[PDB]
From Swiss-Prot, chain B:
Effect of mutating residue 47 to A: Does not affect methylation by VCPKMT
Quaternary structure and partners: Homohexamer. Forms a ring-shaped particle of 12.5 nm diameter, that displays 6-fold radial symmetry. Part of a ternary complex containing STX5A, NSFL1C and VCP. NSFL1C forms a homotrimer that binds to one end of a VCP homohexamer. The complex binds to membranes enriched in phosphatidylethanolamine-containing lipids and promotes Golgi membrane fusion. Binds to a heterodimer of NPLOC4 and UFD1, binding to this heterodimer inhibits Golgi-membrane fusion. Interaction with VCIP135 leads to dissociation of the complex via ATP hydrolysis by VCP.
Substitution effect: residue 51 to A: Does not affect methylation by VCPKMT
Function: Necessary for the fragmentation of Golgi stacks during mitosis and for their reassembly after mitosis. Involved in the formation of the transitional endoplasmic reticulum (tER). The transfer of membranes from the endoplasmic reticulum to the Golgi apparatus occurs via 50-70 nm transition vesicles which derive from part-rough, part-smooth transitional elements of the endoplasmic reticulum (tER). Vesicle budding from the tER is an ATP-dependent process.
Modified residues (N6,N6,N6-trimethyllysine): 50
Domain of life: Eukaryota
Protein name per the record: Transitional endoplasmic reticulum ATPase
Subcellular location as annotated: Cytoplasm, Cytosol; Endoplasmic reticulum; Nucleus; Cytoplasm, Stress granule
């Protein structure tokens, strides 16, 4: 049909019960008097109402009726097109079971009252499955059979009221049992849900495609990744919408112990579905029944893993009843992915973003009145990194806490809890936010959903550094043909100068967060001075890490520290040192050439770390990402003092000019020392004042928040005099000249 | 509430004492608002981490079934516990068996003053003891 969807408005006819059949229904199709436009529904649902229509009188282009829309569960503006439907059955005689809920709670014989209105004025034709309006229960009747041995399509007479099974339906049929909190815009991931639906359909509705492709031994979908979340309970509202098949209900599996019988029934179900068309019934307690090499180091867990491998390698692509995401424990999942079915493909899982939080908030608002002016954008922003079951659970808890607080503050609510009082005392957006802050998501941290050690603005300046990072991001995505016709991409590796704590790791993390990347923030003497021998060992470890986490920007900062100047040319130690140096040269001369392995080293001198790479020998282009020069030490000290207690007169420019030779963290140490000295002075003054007050009730008091509530400029100058400047002026000029001449 | 003594099913019987305890809990909850005198997490189960145990696994399954398919209509408030998290079995630690499990409290100087007040209320020990200084 059409690729752009629309929404269907209300019916043109004012009366909802007047659902006039369209002229096209009787024109394109031979719509007789006893049949109307048969509406297709979800999970193999179909309903047609016998109503006489006059196409020659008035062809009203009205929309669907409200009752018809509710019964058929027709989407708003769905493309009403006739396509091949191979999942429709037929029958001869059926038993029209009455509603069990209407029988209970009715005074006297409810069957006599039900049959009184069933024969005449029942609003139901002569067929099985007709729902009738009942008083009480406040629930819908829509049940899906996971695997029914019999068929669901058969005609039934209305004059014979057949007895039901006697079991009332307590569960809310319209809703879904699983995915209670794990609900996002498309159920977590649109791509993953689409892939699951396609696997469920094509393997069950297009067996010819599988036969021509020849993948018979393929199991199906056994996903991982989203383990432990409400994605563990993501079976319903995705399979409930997809529905379930019939036949081959289950094995007996009733011994309550099932030592080897659990494996026997599992193998039988795996083999039975390979030649049948049963539904993919999600395994209840899938991790519990199948330890999957996670529970015990004995035989049960390994046996579970092996049985999972056999089932994934022993089931055809017809049912694929495999738990996804959290199938087994995340640490040791079942071998259903290790065997056929997920051994070559991953799951397109959507990350927890503000979209999932907003969808959960919308679902909650539809379910209950959160607030009159609930800031769902604020809720989504506060739980942007946490979306899914955690976000919905936290929002529900916050709303419940806010509503409870509002009800308690409104009155005692111990004699007559007014429904208007509770609904009006909605969970205020501020109150809900406060309760959510008091609450927590399932994840240990909501900020752990991104890779960001430092903000892009936290790294002061970095103008040419950010320029180089953006160029690397773009020319590889913008103009990759420009690089290809131009040859190869530029070499990596920066050489910073000055003191340590230059922010190279911080700037790299800032860029990676701005690039939504997990930069491999490498340490110092952790690649060259490798602990497993020569530098080649750590180089290969980093290569494997970058290949498994591409792009993992191997931020091998502090090349001067990376070398660590091992030395020791005596006996076998000299051999080890020479091997380490040669391995470092080899890694710098060919390594994992992907994942943007940029090593922003520290350049204490021209030969302090790898003079050959410092010369244009190893690096064809020693691309040092220049940063804009700022008094970032002054700004950092200002932020720290704001975090502490220094105010009033602060000759920050007058003092920072004395030692301008800083590398961000260089002057921060002096600031920290001055802050510590000021805090010690304040504590001493407080102790002296307390002693004076103890000696005499009115002797002394506290001057301010600190003995020096302003900047302890005297203490700062005293610390500076006790310490020394970072470098001399002649040495600084020589270093600047050396950097410029290169 | 019913105290968590593991020796109940552990007898000459078939371990049915667990089922009897569940039935008694249901009867009391129907009778009135009852609780679960849950002992420390170790007393219940390590979640079959050390061993499974035939009667042990059966009792664990029965407990999980009672906790999950609890009397949702009766709203039987089964009081959970918080011992060492390692002692906590995962099923109750998972939502569905135990509804919501919370942390374990800790003491402080104000609580120290409160306990000192309780002790002094027990008996007037001294007339010069600085309870705040001690706490």
């Amino acid at each position: 049909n059409r690729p752009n969807r629309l929404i269907v408005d209300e019916a043109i006819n004012e009366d909802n019960s007047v659902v006039s059949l369209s002229q096209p229904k009787m024109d394109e199709l031979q719509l007789f008097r006893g049949d109307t436009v048969l509406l297709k529904g979800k999970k193999r649902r179909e309903a047609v109402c016998i109503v006489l229509s006059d196409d020659t009188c008035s062809d009203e282009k009205i929309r669907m009726n409200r009752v018809v829309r509710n019964n058929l569960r027709v989407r708003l503006g769905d493309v009403i097109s006739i396509q091949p439907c191979p999942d429709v059955k037929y029958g001869k005689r059926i038993h029209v079971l009455p509603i069990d809920d209407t029988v209970e709670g009715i005074t006297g014989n409810l069957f006599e009252v039900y049959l009184k209105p069933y024969f005449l004025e029942a609003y139901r034709p002569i067929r099985k499955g007709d729902i009738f309006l009942v008083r009480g229960g406040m629930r819908a009747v829509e049940f899906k059979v996971v695997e029914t041995d019999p068929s669901p399509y058969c005609i039934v007479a209305p004059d014979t009221v057949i007895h039901c099974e006697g079991e009332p339906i307590k569960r809310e049929d319209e809703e879904e049992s699983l995915n209670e909190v794990g609900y996002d815009d498309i159920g977590g991931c649109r791509k993953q849900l689409a892939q699951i639906k396609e696997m469920v359909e094509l393997p069950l509705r297009h067996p010819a495609l599988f036969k021509a492709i020849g993948v018979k031994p393929p199991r199906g979908i056994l996903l991982y990744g989203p383990p432990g979340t409400g994605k563990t309970l993501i079976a319903r509202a995705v399979a409930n919408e997809t529905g379930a098949f019939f036949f081959l209900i289950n094995g007996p599996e009733i011994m309550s112990k099932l030592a080897g019988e659990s494996e026997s029934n599992l193998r039988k179900a795996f083999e039975e579905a390979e030649k049948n068309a049963p539904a993919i019934i999600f395994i209840d307690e899938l991790d519990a029944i199948a330890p999957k090499r996670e529970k015990t180091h004995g035989e049960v867990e390994r046996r579970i893993v092996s049985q999972l491998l056999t089932l994934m390698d022993g089931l055809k692509q017809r049912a694929h009843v495999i738990v996804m995401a959290a199938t087994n424990r995340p640490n040791s999942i079942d071998p259903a992915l290790r065997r056929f079915g997920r051994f070559d493909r991953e799951v397109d899982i959507g990350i927890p973003d503000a979209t999932g939080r907003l969808e959960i908030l919308q679902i909650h608002t539809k379910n209950m009145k959160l607030a009159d002016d609930v800031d769902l954008e604020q809720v989504a922003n506060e739980t942007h990194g946490h979306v899914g079951a955690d976000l919905a659970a936290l929002c529900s808890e916050a709303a419940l806490q806010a509503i409870r607080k509002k009800m308690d503050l409104i009155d005692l609510e111990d004699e007559t809890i007014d429904a208007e009082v509770m609904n009006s005392l909605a969970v205020t957006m501020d109150d809900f936010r406060w309760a959510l802050s008091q609450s927590n998501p399932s994840a240990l941290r909501e900020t752990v959903v991104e890779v960001p050690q430092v903000t892009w603005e936290d790294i002061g300046g970095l103008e040419d550094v950010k320029r180089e990072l953006q160029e690397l991001v773009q020319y590889p995505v913008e103009h990759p043909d420009k690089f290809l016709k131009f040859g190869m991409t530029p070499s990596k590796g920066v050489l910073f100068y000055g003191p340590p704590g230059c922010g190279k790791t911080l700037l790299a993390k800032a860029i990676a967060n701005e690039c939504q990347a997990n930069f491999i923030s490498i340490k110092g003497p952790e690649l060259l001075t490798m602990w497993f021998g020569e530098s080649e060992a750590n180089v290969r470890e980093i290569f494997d890490k970058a290949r498994q986490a591409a792009p993992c920007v191997l931020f091998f900062d502090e090349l001067d520290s990376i070398a660590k100047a091992r030395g020791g040319n005596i006996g076998d130690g000299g051999g080890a040192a020479d091997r380490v140096i040669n391995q470092i040269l080899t890694e710098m001369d060919g390594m994992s050439t992907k994942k943007n392995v940029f090593i922003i080293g520290a350049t204490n001198r021209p030969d302090i770390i790898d003079p050959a790479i410092l010369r244009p020998g190893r690096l064809d282009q020693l691309i040092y990402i220049p940063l804009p020069d700022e008094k970032s030490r002054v700004a950092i000290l200002k932020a720290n003092l704001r975090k502490s207690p220094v105010a009033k007169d602060v000759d920050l420019e007058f003092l920072a000019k004395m030692t301008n030779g800083f590398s961000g963290a260089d002057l921060t140490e002096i600031c920290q020392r001055a802050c510590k000295l000021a805090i010690r002075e304040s504590i001493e003054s407080e102790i002296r004042r307390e002693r004076e007050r103890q000696t005499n009730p009115s002797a002394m008091e506290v001057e301010e928040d600190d003995p020096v509530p302003e900047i302890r400029r005297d203490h700062f100058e005293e610390a500076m005099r006790f310490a020394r400047r970072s470098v001399s002026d002649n040495d600084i000029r020589k270093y600047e000249m050396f950097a410029q001449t290169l």
